[model samples]
Target: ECRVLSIQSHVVRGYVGNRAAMFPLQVLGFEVDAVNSVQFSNHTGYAHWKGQVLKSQELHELYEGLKVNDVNKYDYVLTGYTRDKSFLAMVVDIVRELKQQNSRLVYVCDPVMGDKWNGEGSMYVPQDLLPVYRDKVVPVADIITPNQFEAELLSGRKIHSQEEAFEVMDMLHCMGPDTVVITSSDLPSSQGSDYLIALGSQRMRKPDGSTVTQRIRMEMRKVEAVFVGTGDLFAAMLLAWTHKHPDNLKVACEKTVSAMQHVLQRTIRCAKAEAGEGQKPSPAQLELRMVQSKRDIEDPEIVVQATVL
Candidate 1:
């Protein structure tokens, strides 16, 4: 049986971190064991950045407990923002341990770096951690999902064009990840646009020692509001799809994009009718509204339409 074990931060007051990533995986019918990196009242976007950062020592203790419990075997391990450098190092160690116990283990790293569009720098990720992530984290990651800004930071090249973005994806693939997904990529002239692109590629080595590449372009619609936790949702969906269809990267990408599009469209409609119209959005509105209600993930209805791809 395949299982997902994720290490991420926990926010008590608002939506972000593991809550956004974990729930979608559960909805997709994956058994998820979540390890929180930190706890906060809400997301930092609402000027509620003040919160306690979990101690590194406690994280190490939790890791030791996981080892003692013999829960190192996991099919997929997904990670998001880390509070500090030590915590990031701990995540790398945990991924290494999990892979050692389960050879089929795949790690998806969502580099939660700062976004330039937001102009929110107080909680901006430290630039110094970039090198550590590239050196220590990327090499072990089986899949990497980085937004355009993060992809630029990781590859050290500004992506002003689609061609440049593809080049950056290829550069990231060279760092040891076989699959790369660049999300939220747009050129400077793409402002005021509702559509963004996600690029997926697989790196393969032929028998003659040459590399072959397969690319898939995914068009994503931009939903209104910041829509906290979209990246987490994408990573979780991709992990679940990959676990079931490892040989079909294109299908996994299409399914992930469709699932996200469905969720985002639902969220936007709810947000506009409730919040935009000066009406309060209900709790039920915030919860995931799946396209299909079947408990089983393997149901054909759960398979999102790929026509948009």
Candidate 2:
């Protein structure tokens, strides 16, 4: 059986972090194991919430016990939203240890660094964590999904063009990951201001030991709403779908994008319906319709199309 260890936050109400991620993986037939870094009443995105975040020592203690049970035999390790630097370091240690034990394992990371909204830039995580991500964490990842802001943060380059964006990907290769997935249509290269776009790049070492990267992109209709947990959903989908289609990343990206679009479209429909006529949708009202959209997760119609980039 395929197994994954997801290290992320947990919300008691509404879907975010592991709550958003686990079902998508499980529905796709992966044995989803999780370690919650924080247990909150709801995501901080809400108006109010409560819960304790786990400390670095607590994380170590939890993993120490799991080590005794031989839980290290996972096919993949999944990571998202790390709030503490110490815990982030511990996560790196475990990723390195697990890989030493299983060379075939793949580490997929959603580098949640910062964002550009409210008409300016903001980093929710501590500034010190940026260096940790660039110098330590990212180098070991096999695959990374970073949005426009995160890619800029991780690659340390302002992306203004497609050629410039590829340069950032090349720099990321120099740092470590063999593949990079950019969940951004707002990237400098995109022509459609009203559309959301995503691009995926995979590097394969040829028989001659030379490396080549193949790239593809998906353009989606831009919906006018802010949906939390989409990144979690995207990364989880990519991990499961790519594992199932190891030979074709484009196909994997295709399936993952299709499924997510379906879920988002359904969620938006529900949110709009709930908002009623002549009223705006609130974030709290926009919870992902993952359960209701379960059919889409399993088999989504290819509404969104992918293209070679």
Candidate 3:
């Protein structure tokens, strides 16, 4: 009865966030236990969505309670968006503890800062927290999945080309993560409107030398509009893929990209269904099939093409 425990938030109660992370792992056939970081009526995109952020002490208490119940060991630990710096610190502490207890523990960190298209800075993560991530989170993480923007924030380097993207990945790996995936990268010269790329290098030490580099590439079509929890979905898939194929970076990247493509395609379909004959799209309907099909694990190839459309 091995299990994957995700330390993240529960967006909109029964909606995205923790649910989004868990459903995919479940499809991959892993028992999941989600420790919520926050609970909200919905993602902060809405005009009036109420939510409550759990205090850092409270989060620690919950983690301690889990330990008391003999749940300290986990196969993997996945993180998404964080509401506060304290919460982030708590997560890092928990990850350190878990890895100490289980040498096989895999730490997947998704540095969820904010997106350009979102245009909501209030709910966006703070800049001060960037240092914490750089100094603490990145180095400790086994893998990090950051969008183009987030990668830039982490490295203070712009990603406008494949070379630049690779540079960013290199810098990020230097910060600590041996594996890095730039989930939403778009170089002006690249094909299509938006692209997903996965890159990584071997963990190495330098005596006036540097880490050995290993890189791979995979791409998927970008959907027309941004969807909530897409980054979360990507991180979850990458974690699951890595769990199944620990040493195969290429296979993990391919599977993650393919799975996301399907999810976005289904998301688009669900949106169209909500639009109905000739009506405007309904946001409420967006949640309808968001979790109905386990596209990430069920049908990755078909999903990838659909994502591009």
Give stretches of model 2 more than 4 Å off.
Answer: 188-191
If ranked by lDDT, best first, what sequence of candidates would result? 2, 1, 3
lDDT for 278 in candidate 3 is 61
Give the winner by TM-score: 2 or 3: 2
Best by lDDT, which number? 2
Please give, for residues 1-309, the per-residue lDDT of candidate 3 as tens digits: 548778878875434678778887787777888888888887755556887888989989988999999967798888888858888898889988988999878788898886545432222787778888888888889889887788888898777677788888888877878778777654442565465444444354457776456677665666665467777777887777777776666777777777766666776787777677665554554552546566546556633321110
Shift of residue 206 alpha carbon in model 1, Å: 6.3
Candidates in order, TM-scores: namely 0.84, 0.96, 0.86
lDDT of each: 0.73, 0.85, 0.72
The digit string of per-residue lDDT tens for model 1 on 1-309 reads 657888887877434568777776777777888888777776655543566777778878887887788766688889988748888888888888878787778899998876657532223687778887888999999998988888888898888777888899889998989988887776532334666667788776679998778777766566655567677777887888876677677788877777776666666676666654766554434444443422332332333323222
Segments in model 3 whose C-alpha atoms lie over 4 Å from true places: 12-15, 118-123, 194-212, 276-280, 302-309
TM-score of 3: 0.86
RMSD of 3: 4.2
TM-score of 2: 0.96
* Candidate 3: Cα lDDT at 197: 46
